[PDB]
Symmetry: D2
Subunit: 42 residues, 4 copies
């Protein structure tokens, strides 16, 4: 949990509530793979 | 240009710069179709 | 409508019906912008 | 690995090679979360 200084952070306005939940999902999806991507080679 | 009170607006933090540009594109893409979607039936 | 030889075409299997409709939308969204992107400068 | 009869499968044509790799990524991303989604509650 050290250094939240990973990639520069940004913000984006998303109109619509249903659309928001959709983007949030794809966002967490990529973040999920990125978590297993930094997984040292077994 | 009257009433910016369309769908409720929201905000989302997106880590990574390359990823940001990507999401912005899909966002403008949907907004683009939405613009021609509200096009009265010729 | 000449030369369908634009970018090489590909195919992707998408599990789930609700998910399919979602991807199709983003696909048409980009294709929509691409149509106005090749719009000569007024 | 029993019953590949999960959600009905579909197919989508994606023009452009760079765009294809992009969609494939989001596809695997959702499939990745779906894998941990069916994870029994610890």
């Amino acid at each position: 949990k050290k250094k939240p200084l990973d990639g520069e952070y940004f913000t984006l306005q998303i109109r619509g509530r249903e659309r928001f939940e959709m983007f949030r999902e794809l966002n967490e999806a990529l973040e999920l793979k990125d978590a297993q991507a930094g997984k040292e080679p077994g």
